[PDB]
Amino acid sequence: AACINPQKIGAALQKIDDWWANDADLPLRVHEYGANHEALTALRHPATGQ
């Protein structure tokens, strides 16, 4: 049978990080560095102290 992997379901559920830069936009998948795969960047880069 066709399926969707466990962590692929999980990645969708936990996408609720919109606490950065006082601009809600859409939320990020919780990540220690604030990674953003679509733009190839990182919102909470260690250089910021965030």
């Binding site: 830069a21 733009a39 190839l40």
Partner: protein, 387 residues
């Protein structure tokens, strides 16, 4: 002697020496250089005697010492600290595109190439009213004159002997010659000394002088590719007619090369460099020194065009024009901002990066990486101002 409102620095000094009777070479050397030396040694060491050499844009590094010499004169002649400095031609702080040298005189910057270094002409119909070599003759793009019945500036071979005022410092007559009291478009070309226009329908008919100079420089490299033949009058004379239908011709020049480029296509367009189709027309926009859109009218029309181009080509399954890649230095030009600002704009996530680089590396400013449609939209959305 008082300066004229339009007088060259060298003209004033020549008159001054002569007014005090310091007519001969030896006393010109003397009344100038030796006096300066005896004030202080630096005012003379920075001061060669030959007239052409005296101006700042001919100078090297020790300009401040030459200025000190100007300041000594300002005291001797009962002046003001900037009375002479308002007249001198200095090194511009502005590159005027592609690292060109450009020269600055109290608010107007003129590219090095337009300085008429040799064979200064004259107009007897004004020299008989006040005899002093005047400014706006030293300009290459300037043949003929306003007023005086127009006609031509009386050119260098007055009488079987080439003339100028610097290798032979007389005003009314020169060397072997006598007191010199000797086709209807150039009187418009003449207006580099001032603007003075009304009912300025062409895009070349309005603005400050620096812009009017830049527009001509651009026209020349782009359409007068023929090697210099010192057709200094005729070569540039045509630029005004050219611009009269500009609002409707520039776009066709750009359209023509979209089609000729397209039929020579070898890769899918979403991996093609913007430059391969438009041939750096964007970089040329940097030859006019102003950054904002309301004054740099060449850039204003190029953006107009690109916005329309994207608008008639929306995204679908097969890639098309509008998906071309720009480099960092190109977005900086279209977005009317410096490069570091684009890096900051990327870092905050306002725009995507399309090519994945290797690790332990960096993407250089020259690398092509943003899609055209993404830049056009972002600019409309968050980069506008009152300019």
């Amino acid at each position: 002697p008082e300066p004229f409102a339009d007088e060259a620095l060298e003209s004033y000094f020549l008159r001054l020496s002569q007014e005090n009777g310091f007519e001969r070479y030896r006393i010109f050397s003397g009344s100038v250089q030796d006096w300066l030396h005896t004030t202080d040694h630096a005012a003379a060491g920075a001061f060669p005697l030959e007239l052409s050499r005296l101006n700042i844009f001919h100078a090297s590094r020790s300009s401040g010492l030459r200025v000190r010499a100007l300041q000594l004169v300002d005291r001797l002649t009962d002046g003001a600290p900037f009375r002479l400095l308002q007249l001198a031609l200095c090194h511009s702080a502005i590159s005027f595109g592609n690292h060109y040298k450009a020269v600055h005189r109290s608010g107007v910057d003129i590219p090095l190439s337009f300085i008429r270094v040799h064979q200064i002409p004259c107009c007897p119909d004004c020299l008989r009213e006040s005899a002093y070599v005047r400014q706006c003759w030293h300009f290459k793009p300037y043949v003929g004159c306003h007023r005086h019945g127009g006609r031509l500036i009386y050119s260098c071979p007055a009488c079987g002997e080439s003339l100028n005022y610097l290798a032979s410092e007389s005003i009314n007559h020169c060397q072997c010659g006598f007191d010199l009291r000797t086709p209807d478009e150039i009187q418009l070309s003449a207006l580099a000394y001032g603007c003075s226009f009304e009912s300025s329908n062409p895009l070349l008919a309005i603005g400050s002088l620096s812009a009017r100079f830049g527009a001509l420089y651009w026209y020349q490299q782009r359409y007068l590719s023929d090697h210099e033949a010192v057709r200094d009058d005729r070569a540039l004379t045509k630029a005004i007619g050219h611009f009269t239908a500009w609002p409707d011709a520039f776009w066709r020049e750009l359209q023509q090369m979209v089609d000729d480029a397209l039929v020579r296509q070898t890769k899918p367009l979403n991996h093609t460099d913007f430059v391969d189709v438009f041939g750096s027309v964007v970089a040329d926009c940097r030859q006019i020194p102003m950054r904002n859109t309301g004054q740099n009218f060449i850039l204003k029309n190029l953006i107009g065009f690109l916005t329309d181009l994207v608008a008639r080509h929306p995204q679908c399954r097969v890639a098309n024009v509008g998906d071309l890649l720009l480099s960092a230095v190109d977005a900086a030009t279209l977005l009317s901002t410096s490069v570091e600002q684009v890096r900051r704009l990327h870092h905050e996530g306002f725009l995507p990066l399309s090519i994945r680089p290797a690790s332990r590396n960096t993407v250089s400013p020259h690398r092509a990486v943003f899609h055209l449609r993404h830049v056009v939209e972002l600019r409309q959305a968050r980069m506008q101002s009152h300019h």
